[PDB]
């Protein structure tokens, strides 16, 4: 039950988890997608605004030198360096770390499944994901909704045109005024409305894909060429659980460097520490990365839904609480 020495996950659960891991490796082996292993520690980190990484320090043999390192929040930068090196389609099942993150569906350290597909647009990648969710969750083909139509459907509002006033009252109808009336960031408003207005009503029977997030929420995705208002970014949800985030990767070194610079300006303006831009990723982008699409999926969450567990701690040998 709860004696701290005991694992948070049950043996039966661990047995099935492993089986799902193998099911996942097989799926990629059948598609000729190579497996790789990138570092957990690095001299660089990510600038993404809401993430806060773990830090640790390396001290060389005999107490000679010193060197600060960051634990990877995701394997993305290293894998992009590899795509440029010419590795072809690759995937990875690694352990990632995110500080300040713990709860029913979050653990400071979790298992991530991330893969890249050269020459696959956002749609061909999404279809691959769907095939994976179908085999592991044993569910029907997911549905696909655009960020725009998801808002209109469930909130009768257009996230691409509506303005702070119009959507601040949708927040009042959702009873979120306390966190909205005082928010002057349009994007933060949208996220607030999406995560609390759309996410909980999505993917009830089968998983649901939501693409074309607003351009402001592109992260490392390309901006659409058709509609400069949306980005080539997508996420997939099931039973109210966020399963993966992916996108048609941005390959313009210039633009990618500007966004990282903006991330740092936003962080400072908020009192958050600034993180040095990973020059290796930039440098590799300058050499030229293959046109491609990638995606990161929370394995722990996939296993959780597949075994019908109620919490993430149930499918993890030892969650932080007792690690």
């Amino acid at each position: 039950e709860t004696a701290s020495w005991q694992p948070s996950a049950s043996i039966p659960n661990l047995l099935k988890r492993a089986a799902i891991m193998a099911e996942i490796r097989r799926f990629f082996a059948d598609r000729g997608v190579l497996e790789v292993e990138t570092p957990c520690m690095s001299q660089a980190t990510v600038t993404d605004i809401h993430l806060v990484p773990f830090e640790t320090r390396f001290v060389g043999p005999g107490h000679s030198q010193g060197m600060n390192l960051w634990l990877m929040t995701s394997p993305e930068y290293h894998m992009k360096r590899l795509l440029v090196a010419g590795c072809g389609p690759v995937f990875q099942l690694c352990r990632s770390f995110r500080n300040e993150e713990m709860g029913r569906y979050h653990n400071p350290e979790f298992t991530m499944l991330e893969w890249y597909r050269p020459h696959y647009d956002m749609y061909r990648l999404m279809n691959e994901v769907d095939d994976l969710l179908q085999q592991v969750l044993d569910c029907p083909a997911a549905e696909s909704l655009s960020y725009q139509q998801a808002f209109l459907r469930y909130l009768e509002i257009d996230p691409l045109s509506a303005d702070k006033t119009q959507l601040r009252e949708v927040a009042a109808k959702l009873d979120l005024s306390n966190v909205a009336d005082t928010e002057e960031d349009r994007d933060t408003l949208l996220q607030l409305l999406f995560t609390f207005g759309v996410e909980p009503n999505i993917g009830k029977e089968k998983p649901t894909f939501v693409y074309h997030f607003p351009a402001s929420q592109a992260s490392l995705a390309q901006i659409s060429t058709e509609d400069h208002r949306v980005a080539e970014r997508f996420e997939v949800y099931y039973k109210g659980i966020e399963l993966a985030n992916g996108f048609h990767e941005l390959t313009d070194a210039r633009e990618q460097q500007q966004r990282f610079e903006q991330d740092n300006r936003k962080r400072a303006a908020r009192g958050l520490p600034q993180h040095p831009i990973d020059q290796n990723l930039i440098e590799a982008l300058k050499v030229g990365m293959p046109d491609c699409s990638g995606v990161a999926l929370g394995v722990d969450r996939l296993v959780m839904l597949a075994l019908g567990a109620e919490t993430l701690a149930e499918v993890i040998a030892f969650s932080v609480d007792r690690a």
Binding site: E101, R104, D175, N178, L192, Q217, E242
Partner: protein
């Protein structure tokens, strides 16, 4: 004051002028978004359940809401009277406070009264009463 991520069940907090009880709390942090607390609360002044969102860095004011096991005296059709066998003090509960309980409030019987800032807002009758069959 308490911090969003301390909202354990049973916590009484003041919100937009009213007293609430925390039923449950959940950590939410979507892709590329900030961290939140999704809290299921008990709106005391109306006994309904509501859900609220807070930034993980938000906080709230603890509210004064305790449960005195005062004894029921009588009601004049409008107010229900209770007393403290120790304090010797009396309090009046209006029809909305005693709510759908007057049915079991038999004269002279100990009850558990929920009072917000002294005055009652909730009445909990010991549902082990022996009544008449009129």
């Amino acid at each position: 004051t308490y911090y969003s991520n301390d909202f354990r069940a049973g916590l009484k907090i003041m919100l937009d002028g009213e007293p609430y009880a925390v039923e449950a709390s959940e950590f939410v942090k979507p892709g590329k978004g900030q961290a939140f607390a999704r809290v299921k609360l008990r709106r005391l002044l109306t006994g309904t359940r509501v859900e609220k969102t807070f930034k993980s860095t938000d906080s709230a004011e603890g509210a004064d809401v305790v449960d005195m096991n005062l004894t029921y005296l009588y009601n004049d059709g409008e107010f229900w009277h209770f007393m403290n066998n120790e304090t010797f003090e009396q309090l009046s509960a209006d029809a909305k406070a005693i709510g759908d309980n007057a049915k079991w409030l038999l004269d002279q019987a100990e009850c558990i009264v929920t009072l917000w800032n002294g005055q009652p807002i909730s009445v909990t009758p010991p549902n082990f009463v022996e009544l008449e069959i009129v």
